[PDB]
Design a protein around this ligand. Sequence first.
Ligand SMILES: Cc1cc2nc3c(=O)[nH]c(=O)nc-3n(C[C@H](O)[C@H](O)[C@H](O)COP(=O)(O)OP(=O)(O)OC[C@H]3O[C@@H](n4cnc5c(N)ncnc54)[C@H](O)[C@@H]3O)c2cc1C
Ligand SMILES: CCCCCCCCO[C@@H]1O[C@H](CO)[C@@H](O)[C@H](O)[C@H]1O
Ligand SMILES: CCCCCCCCO[C@@H]1O[C@H](CO)[C@@H](O)[C@H](O)[C@H]1O
Ligand SMILES: CCCCCCCCO[C@@H]1O[C@H](CO)[C@@H](O)[C@H](O)[C@H]1O
Ligand SMILES: CCCCCCCCO[C@@H]1O[C@H](CO)[C@@H](O)[C@H](O)[C@H]1O
Ligand SMILES: O=S(=O)(O)CCCNC(CO)(CO)CO
Length: 494
Amino acid sequence: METKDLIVIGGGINGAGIAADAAGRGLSVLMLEAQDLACATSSASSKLIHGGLRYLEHYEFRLVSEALAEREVLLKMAPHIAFPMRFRLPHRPHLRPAWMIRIGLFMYDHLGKRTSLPGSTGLRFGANSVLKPEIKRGFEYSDCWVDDARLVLANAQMVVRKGGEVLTRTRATSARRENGLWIVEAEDIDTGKKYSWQARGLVNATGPWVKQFFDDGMHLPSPYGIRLIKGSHIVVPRVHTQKQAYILQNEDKRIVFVIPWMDEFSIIGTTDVEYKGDPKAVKIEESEINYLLNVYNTHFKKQLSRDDIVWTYSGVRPLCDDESDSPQAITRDYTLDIHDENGKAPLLSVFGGKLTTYRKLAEHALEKLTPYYQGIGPAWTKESVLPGGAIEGDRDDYAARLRRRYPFLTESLARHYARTYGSNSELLLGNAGTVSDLGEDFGHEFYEAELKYLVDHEWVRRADDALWRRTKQGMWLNADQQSRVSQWLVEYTQ
Ligand SMILES: Cc1cc2nc3c(=O)[nH]c(=O)nc-3n(C[C@H](O)[C@H](O)[C@H](O)COP(=O)(O)OP(=O)(O)OC[C@H]3O[C@@H](n4cnc5c(N)ncnc54)[C@H](O)[C@@H]3O)c2cc1C
Ligand SMILES: CCCCCCCCO[C@@H]1O[C@H](CO)[C@@H](O)[C@H](O)[C@H]1O
Ligand SMILES: CCCCCCCCO[C@@H]1O[C@H](CO)[C@@H](O)[C@H](O)[C@H]1O
Ligand SMILES: CCCCCCCCO[C@@H]1O[C@H](CO)[C@@H](O)[C@H](O)[C@H]1O
Ligand SMILES: CCCCCCCCO[C@@H]1O[C@H](CO)[C@@H](O)[C@H](O)[C@H]1O
Ligand SMILES: O=S(=O)(O)CCCNC(CO)(CO)CO
C-alpha cells in the first residue's frame, strides 16, 4: 500500500488547490499534470483576484460575494505574488447610467466584507488626463492582482510540503473502477514510461478537458456540458505611468481591462469567443486584436497600433454550460459533481471555477469527499500561508530586507526575487555571497542559481516553464538567450 487515498488529475489552479487541501488533511495525494503546472487556462487569465463586478448585472450574488471575500484570504496567503490594485471605470452614460454604477459599487463594497481594501470613489477627468477630453467622469474601486501561474506553483509546493506527490509531464490515459478501488493509468509524455496506481478517490480537475476525460479516459457520462470560451490578451509597452488599472465599458456591454504589468508593460484584455477544438491550439485572431485596440483607442488619447504589440496570449474558459446564447452571459460560477458506486471509489469532477474562487472550490470538494475518508482532518486553508508567502510585511519591505541581508543584489534583482519567490528566496540564494556565486548570466539578471532552483524546487523541465510560467523573463530574453536556457536544461536534467 502502494494505494493512494486520492488521485487528482489536472495541475492547473483547481487541481493544485484540491490536492493541497487534501494533503493537509492527512490524505495521501498524488496530483498528475500532463505537461507543466498551469500550462493551460491557469496561466492565460487576466491575473485578477476580483469580485466580478460585471456579474452583478446577471444576479450572480453567490459568486460575487464569495469572490469578494476571498480577495483578502488570498492576499494573506500569498502576499509575495498577490497585491491590491485600484480600478478606474470611465463614465459612458449612454451605456450605463451613473445611478446604476453608483449602486453596484455599493454592493461590491459590502457584499463580501473587507477588513482592509479601500472603498469606491468618483473621479473627474480633465484636459490633462490619459483619457480622451470628452470623457469627464468616472469611478474607482478595489480588486487584486495575482501572478496566476505562480499561485498554481505555490499550491503544488504545498502538496509536497504536506507529504503528497506531484508528477508533471505525466498524462493520465485512463481511470476505471475495479473491486472498490480506482485504477489510474498514466504515461510520461517524453519517455513513454507507463504507470498504474490504485486509489480510494479520484478528482477530475482537467479544466477544458473535463468532459473529454469522461469520454476518452473513463468511458463514463459527464454530468455537465462544457462551453469553451476563448479569451485573448495583448501586451504593449506601458500606455501610461499611472499605477491604476482602467476598466472600460465597450458598446457590446462587455468590459475590457487595461492593467499595469511589471512596471514596464500594459496588458489589454479580454474577449469572449466561442471555441471548438484543441484547447492547446488556442491563439489570438485578427478580430480580437482589432476589438481590443478599438476599445482602448476610443477611450485613451495615446493611440496604439498593431505594431506596438510586444506579446499576446490566449486561453479557453472551461465554463459550466448553462446553455446561454451569449458567451459573455454564461455563468462564471463553478459546479462540482460527486459520484460513487456501491458507496466506494468516489469521483469528484470540477466544472468551471475562476482563479479567484479556487480555495473555496477546493474546500467544497473535500467536504464532498469527507464521508469516504476515515479520520480525515478538518478544513484548514483559510489560515495557511502558501510556500513563499512568509514575508512579514509587503513585497516591497521584503525586497528591501533581502538587499539588507544579501547586499550584492541590485535593487532590480532583489525586487524580482521578492515578488517571485518571496520567502523561498533564501533557498534559491543558498550559500551565494557575491553576484559571481549566482553563476551564468542568461540575460536580464536571470542567473544559473535561479534556473537551478527552478528545476530543483519548481518542476521546471523546459525553457517555457521557467521563462513563461514560473517567471515572465521570456518578455526580455532574446531567441538566442532562450535557446541557451534550453541547452542548459538539457545538460542539467540529462
Ligand atoms: C481569458 C481568461 C481570463 C481569465 N481571467 C481571470 C481572472 O482575471 N481572475 C480569475 O479568477 N480567473 C480568470 N480566468 C478563469 C481561470 O483562468 C480559470 O477558471 C482557471 O484557470 C481554471 O483552471 P483549471 O485548473 O480548472 O483548468 P486547468 O488546470 O488550467 O486545465 C487542466 C489542466 O490539467 C492538465 N490536464 C488536462 N487533462 C489531463 C489529463 N488527461 N491527464 C493529466 N493532466 C491533464 C493540463 O495539462 C491542464 O493544464 C480567466 C480565464 C480566461 C480564459
Ligand atoms: C451634463 C451636465 C452635468 C455635468 C456632469 C457630467 C456629465 C456626466 O453625467 C451623466 O450624464 C448622462 C446624460 O448625458 C446621464 O445618463 C448620467 O447618468 C449622468 O451622470
Ligand atoms: C452614495 C452612492 C449611492 C447613490 C444612489 C444612486 C444615486 C446616484 O445618482 C447619480 O449621481 C450623479 C452625481 O450627481 C448624477 O449625475 C446622476 O444624474 C445620478 O443618476
Ligand atoms: C431597466 C433599468 C430601470 C430600472 C427601474 C428603476 C427606475 C429607474 O429610474 C431611475 O432611478 C434613479 C434612482 O434610483 C434616478 O436617479 C434616475 O434619474 C431614474 O431615471
Ligand atoms: C435590486 C437588484 C438589482 C441588481 C442589479 C445590480 C446592478 C449592477 O450593475 C453593475 O454596475 C457596475 C458598476 O458598479 C458595472 O461595472 C457593471 O457592468 C454592472 O453590471
Ligand atoms: O521545494 S518543494 O519541496 O516545495 C518542491 C520540490 C519539488 N522538487 C522536484 C525536484 O525534481 C521538482 O522541482 C520534484 O520532486
